[PDB]
Design a protein around this motif. Structure first.
Motif, PDB file in Angstrom:
ATOM      1  N   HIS B   2       0.751  -1.237  -0.042  1.00  0.00           N
ATOM      2  CA  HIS B   2       0.079   0.130   0.063  1.00  0.00           C
ATOM      3  C   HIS B   2       0.920   1.189   0.030  1.00  0.00           C
ATOM      4  O   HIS B   2       2.106   1.177   0.561  1.00  0.00           O
ATOM      5  CB  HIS B   2      -1.066  -0.124   1.273  1.00  0.00           C
ATOM      6  CG  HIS B   2      -0.153   0.630   2.389  1.00  0.00           C
ATOM      7  ND1 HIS B   2       0.563  -0.614   3.195  1.00  0.00           N
ATOM      8  CD2 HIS B   2      -0.366   1.780   3.103  1.00  0.00           C
ATOM      9  CE1 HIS B   2       1.079   0.421   4.105  1.00  0.00           C
ATOM     10  NE2 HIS B   2       0.585   1.610   4.244  1.00  0.00           N
ATOM     11  N   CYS B   3       0.512   2.355  -0.722  1.00  0.00           N
ATOM     12  CA  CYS B   3       1.034   3.681  -0.677  1.00  0.00           C
ATOM     13  C   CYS B   3       1.019   4.257   0.633  1.00  0.00           C
ATOM     14  O   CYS B   3      -0.201   4.773   0.913  1.00  0.00           O
ATOM     15  CB  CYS B   3       0.756   4.276  -1.884  1.00  0.00           C
ATOM     16  SG  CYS B   3       1.406   6.069  -1.711  1.00  0.00           S
ATOM     17  N   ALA B   4       2.024   4.532   1.107  1.00  0.00           N
ATOM     18  CA  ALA B   4       1.743   5.141   2.590  1.00  0.00           C
ATOM     19  C   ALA B   4       1.493   6.550   2.407  1.00  0.00           C
ATOM     20  O   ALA B   4       0.771   7.030   3.424  1.00  0.00           O
ATOM     21  CB  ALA B   4       3.134   5.010   3.399  1.00  0.00           C
ATOM     22  N   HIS B   5       1.705   7.280   1.357  1.00  0.00           N
ATOM     23  CA  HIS B   5       1.531   8.509   1.124  1.00  0.00           C
ATOM     24  C   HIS B   5      -0.020   8.693   0.642  1.00  0.00           C
ATOM     25  O   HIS B   5      -0.803   9.519   1.386  1.00  0.00           O
ATOM     26  CB  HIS B   5       2.229   9.053  -0.007  1.00  0.00           C
ATOM     27  CG  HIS B   5       3.512   9.484   0.286  1.00  0.00           C
ATOM     28  ND1 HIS B   5       4.599   9.784  -0.460  1.00  0.00           N
ATOM     29  CD2 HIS B   5       4.102   9.415   1.561  1.00  0.00           C
ATOM     30  CE1 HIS B   5       5.693   9.814   0.287  1.00  0.00           C
ATOM     31  NE2 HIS B   5       5.502   9.597   1.669  1.00  0.00           N
ATOM     32  N   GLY B   7      -2.313   5.925   0.572  1.00  0.00           N
ATOM     33  CA  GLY B   7      -3.295   4.695   1.154  1.00  0.00           C
ATOM     34  C   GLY B   7      -3.844   3.986  -0.084  1.00  0.00           C
ATOM     35  O   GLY B   7      -4.866   3.372   0.198  1.00  0.00           O
TER      36      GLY B   7
END
Ligand SMILES: [Zn+2]
Ligand SMILES: [Zn+2]
Ligand SMILES: [Zn+2]
Ligand SMILES: [Zn+2]
Ligand SMILES: [Zn+2]
Ligand SMILES: [Zn+2]
Ligand SMILES: [Zn+2]
Ligand SMILES: [Zn+2]
Ligand SMILES: [Zn+2]
Lengths: 123, 123, 123
Positions: B2-5, B7
């Protein structure tokens, strides 16, 4: 922060319309050939654009009312004070709107922002 | 995964950067004009590219150490064995990295993969 | 209403394939250069296209069987009634399919619709 029509995240800003839309909105015929950007990448541009517009209108309003105060200090000057109230109305509403857009969130800031821009251009 | 920036799901591979990104990442200025593909459609290309690179470095490492073993079998040859240890370091770390990328998941395989490619090119 | 392969919403209609796909499907090599639209914006076009096709086949079927009834009213005419049954089969199945697509949902309506179109074209 959600598209009521599609239930998707409002994270795209269309430059043609000045609206904040979702990715399914971007596919509809409404925005067939429109350029979109991430909301997070146009906020600063418009924030500063509205800041300057607010400042220039506050100054024009301050000048107007200090003048309007001299007249009211004499008291039909009453009808003249009434005219000033009717003439400067749209400015008082615009100043209010910008204060709301700047203080609030990115959604309130950008949705239909281009419409508020053109109204600012009118005065 | 998942993209932490943002989501969002990391399922897009940018060819310009060699990064695994999300669909909102794809919209940012960082990848304004970059070509992206589905992670599931470039894995095989890079997997085989790293397999061959691992094999060729294992062979170069095997040749090097068998030679290094003859020297150590004589025992300042000690400083020569020290040089070999310092010269072949980057290969030992690269071999380790590739073994990790190949054994693991698609994320570990492809993220910044192009950076590991250029390091392999250096030797 | 979900893509079993990607777990995403089936909301895109590809014109090249006549399939209802998800946004990750749209990225795959299968639809590399295909034009997609929102399912909600092509339904009416195809709905009316199938309505007319159903009507014209119902009329052709009604004409055929009223004729087939005269023969059966005489009773080897039996083999002639058998031929009519075998000749008009594909129409009976197509009429059934269209009645299913029109009565049902948008998914049943559009998925592989272009395949049903070409079968209608054959007769
Ligand atoms: Zn929407
Ligand atoms: Zn638009
Ligand atoms: Zn006044
Ligand atoms: Zn992202
Ligand atoms: Zn990129
Ligand atoms: Zn050695
Ligand atoms: Zn799919
Ligand atoms: Zn397609
Ligand atoms: Zn018949």
């Amino acid at each position: 922060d959600h598209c009521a029509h599609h239930g998707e995240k409002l994270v795209l800003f269309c430059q043609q319309d000045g609206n904040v839309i979702c990715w399914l909105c971007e596919r509809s015929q409404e925005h067939r050939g429109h350029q979109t950007f991430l909301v997070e990448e146009v906020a600063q541009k418009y924030r500063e654009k509205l800041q300057v517009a607010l400042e220039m209108m506050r100054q024009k309003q301050k000048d107007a009312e200090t003048e309007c105060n001299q007249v009211a200090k004499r008291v039909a000057l009453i009808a003249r004070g009434k005219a000033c109230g009717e003439q400067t109305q749209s400015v008082r509403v615009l100043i209010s709107d910008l204060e709301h857009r700047l203080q609030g969130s990115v959604m309130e800031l950008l949705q239909g922002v281009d419409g508020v821009i053109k109204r600012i251009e009118k005065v």
